[PDB]
Design a protein around this ligand. Structure first.
Ligand code: HEM
Ligand SMILES: *[C@@H]1O[C@H](CO)[C@@H](O[C@@H]2O[C@H](CO)[C@@H](O)[C@H](O)[C@H]2NC(C)=O)[C@H](O)[C@H]1NC(C)=O
Ligand SMILES: *[C@@H]1O[C@H](CO)[C@@H](O)[C@H](O)[C@H]1NC(C)=O
Ligand SMILES: *[C@@H]1O[C@H](CO)[C@@H](O)[C@H](O)[C@H]1NC(C)=O
Ligand SMILES: *[C@@H]1O[C@H](CO)[C@@H](O)[C@H](O)[C@H]1NC(C)=O
Ligand SMILES: [NH3+]CCc1ccccc1
Ligand SMILES: [Ca+2]
Length: 595
């Protein structure tokens, strides 16, 4: 529209063009248009951004400025009146393991990250956001409404700093503000490997020709590997226990240690990598580290894609899976593979699937120790609970035998996330994910709920009575309309999530459309898609076709009792089999022939 293309990206990329491997940054996936899908580019705008000034100023900023003739409600007020609930009883999903939630988070982290602006590591203005709660520049604090208990305890607000945007980091005043996606759009295990060359390299084991990802040298898990510690201080995993002195983990994605089960699945993936590297060395002793790394990386890449696309997506999207992600018909170099700005909110449906506790299960799948169960809020940036209290295995058994929170129109987000979120740099277990999601919709310039309804070719309710029929909930519809005066103002995150789930799925129609499209595009638009003719051999594919999250567990833990269908709710011992009953990854087709 404006300037041909914006001036100040990562400008130096030379496409090999013959390379059989994905670049780290994701550049060179598309040949005609090489920046497509690459990390640290602008998130895609499926619809034009909507900001109160049309450019950058988020709705809700200027008191006197309406959205469609109405004040937008306080994020935190929306949280309190709609998102919140007291009673955790009866909230569990009777057919989705805890792993179903966790896998979402994993996948999510592979696809998008719009980090908060730096605008200066030296910042008394950072202190001006937290302490004085004054709105300015990139400080966009979440003010507590009147009647809010955090008011009595936490001051006037929750600090909140605006997401980064492309072109410059300091001001931009031409095209509408586009936030950055710091990770590669492609489903390619970038959460394990990195989306930049530094980290990709820091993460690697460059101490031997083995193609290993670097592992923790301080600690071990009954002989199994941990990721390296992130030695940059301040470490918020250090901050949450002064005594334990256990730092956050160091992975391809900076959020890995955000919660203990995310760290857990990260650890499983790292392990898998190294495991794969080692078999490739047995099978191919002639190979340099580089080729071990890459080929392992690529298997791992495909594993994540299969589990996601074969096992995960069908149980999210349900009866819509087929309508949005039909059978693969090969790579198409015209499909846009970028993550959209809206997706990054759509995929936050997962916030409502997170239960209030996490458990450690012993080898009989019973409470491992006296504190088996723990509140979720005590596990944010909590690595010590893995290192100094049982390792990966008891958490993993928890992931299999425990349940995801069912999303519920009267019980949206657990107070673990909604009132007790810990954020790094900040000090309290006292933050609101739901409120944060909402301020962020706004921060990102999101079109309203009805815009997205229009987009998905869905009815656009204009009335209370209209909203009730779409939401299938009178009270919910009233609450929302009492805050947002028009469904046109409902923030996409809360609106989409407000919708009843599709048959066999776990998101409503609007979301299923948004998610389904994105995932269709990331598959169809990916040259390196595992199932694209030529990427793997057709023998290799018959091998890959049998992967399972269960198998991954078996291989990279000492969990010997696993379910066949890891994502559904599974009770021990009935639904559990021995690892022996579970199909293996046959790396035979990876035997190399020089002669
Ligand atoms: C205990 C579990 C979880 C914790 C503590 C958590 C925490 C967070 C936090 C603090 C953010 C940044 C919010 C912001 O400032 O905008 C975030 C972003 C997000 N989360 Fe959640 N989350 C959890 C589970 C999930 C699940 C289960 C999913 C999806 C299934 C999910 C999807 C996302 C997405 C897509 C983003 C935006 C990423 C981006 O910046 O592009 N997370 N998560
Ligand atoms: C900080 O982590 C330390 C490190 O373990 C915890 O202390 C341990 O507590 C358990 C019982 O829960 C004992 O089995 C260990 O022997 C204790 N170790 C030490 C060094 O005291 C402590 O609970 C953690 N504290 C907080 C506040 O989270
Ligand atoms: C790299 O691999 C070598 C050989 O296995 C191992 O001795 C070394 O500890 C590894 N280094 C790191 C940081 O993992
Ligand atoms: C590839 O995608 C584009 C746009 O969605 C469409 O124009 C095209 O016809 C598709 N390609 C093939 C080979 O069917
Ligand atoms: C549980 O969900 C799975 C799909 O994940 C489905 O095949 C199965 O029929 C479901 N079982 C029940 C009892 O709903
Ligand atoms: N998934 C969100 C990860 C996260 C949590 C807290 C601060 C930064 C990032
Ligand atoms: Ca990626």
């Amino acid at each position: 529209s404006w300037e041909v293309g914006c001036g100040a990206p990562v400008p130096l990329v030379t496409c090999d063009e013959q390379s059989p491997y994905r670049t780290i940054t994701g550049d060179c996936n598309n040949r005609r248009s090489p920046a497509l899908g690459a990390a640290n580019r602008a998130l895609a705008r499926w619809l034009p951004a909507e900001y109160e000034d049309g450019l950058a100023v988020p709705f809700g900023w200027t008191q006197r400025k309406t959205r469609n003739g109405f004040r937008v409600p306080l994020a935190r007020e929306v949280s309190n009146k709609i998102v919140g609930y007291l009673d955790e009883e009866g909230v569990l999903d009777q057919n989705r393991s805890l792993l179903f939630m966790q896998w979402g988070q994993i996948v999510d982290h592979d696809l998008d990250f719009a980090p908060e602006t730096e605008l200066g590591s030296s910042e008394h203005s950072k202190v001006q956001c937290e302490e004085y709660c004054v709105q300015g520049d990139e400080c966009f604090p979440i003010m507590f409404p009147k009647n809010d208990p955090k008011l009595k305890t936490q001051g006037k607000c929750m600090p909140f700093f605006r997401a980064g945007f492309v072109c410059p980091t300091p001001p931009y005043q031409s095209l509408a503000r586009d936030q950055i996606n710091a990770v590669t759009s492609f489903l390619d295990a970038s959460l394990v490997y990195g989306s930049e060359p530094s980290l990709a390299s820091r993460l690697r084991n460059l101490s031997s020709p083995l193609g290993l990802m670097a592992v923790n040298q301080e600690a071990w898990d009954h002989g199994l590997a941990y990721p390296p510690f992130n030695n940059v201080k301040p470490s918020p995993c250090e901050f949450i226990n002064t005594t334990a002195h256990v730092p956050c983990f160091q992975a391809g994605d900076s959020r890995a240690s955000e919660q203990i089960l995310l760290a857990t699945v990260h650890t499983l993936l790292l392990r898998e990598h190294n495991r794969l590297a080692r078999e490739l060395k047995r099978l191919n002793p002639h190979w340099d580290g580089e080729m071990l790394y890459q080929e392992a990386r690529k298997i791992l890449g495909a594993f994540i894609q299969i589990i996601t696309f074969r096992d995960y997506l069908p149980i999210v999207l349900g009866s819509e899976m087929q309508k949005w992600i039909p059978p693969y018909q090969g790579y198409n170099n015209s499909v846009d593979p970028r993550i959209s700005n809206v997706f990054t909110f759509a995929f936050r449906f997962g916030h409502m699937e997170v239960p209030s506790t996490v458990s450690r299960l012993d080898e009989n799948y019973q409470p491992w120790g006296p504190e088996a169960e723990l509140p979720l809020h005590t596990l944010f940036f909590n690595t010590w609970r893995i290192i100094k209290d049982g390792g990966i295995d008891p958490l993993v058994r928890g992931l299999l035998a425990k349940n995801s929170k069912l999303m519920n129109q009267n019980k949206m987000v657990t107070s673990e996330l909604r009132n007790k979120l810990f954020q790094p740099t900040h000090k309290v277990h006292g933050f609101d994910l739901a409120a944060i999601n909402l301020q962020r919709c706004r921060d990102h310039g999101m079109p309203g709920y009805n815009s997205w309804r229009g987009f998905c070719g869905l009815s656009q309710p204009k009335t209370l009575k209209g909203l009730q029929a779409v939401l299938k909930n009178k009270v919910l519809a009233k609450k929302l309309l009492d805050l947002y005066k028009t469904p046109d103002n409902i923030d996409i995150w809360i609106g989409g999530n407000a919708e009843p789930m599709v048959e066999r799925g776990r998101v409503g129609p609007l979301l299923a459309c948004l998610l389904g499209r994105q995932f269709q595009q990331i598959r169809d638009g990916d040259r390196f898609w595992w199932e694209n003719p030529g990427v793997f051999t057709e023998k290799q594919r018959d091998s890959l076709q049998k992967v399972s999250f269960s198998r991954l567990i078996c291989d990279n833990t000492h969990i010997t009792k696993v379910p066949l269908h890891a994502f559904q709710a599974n009770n021990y011992p009935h639904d559990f089999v021995d690892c022996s009953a579970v199909d293996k990854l046959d790396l035979s087709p990876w035997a190399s022939r020089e002669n």
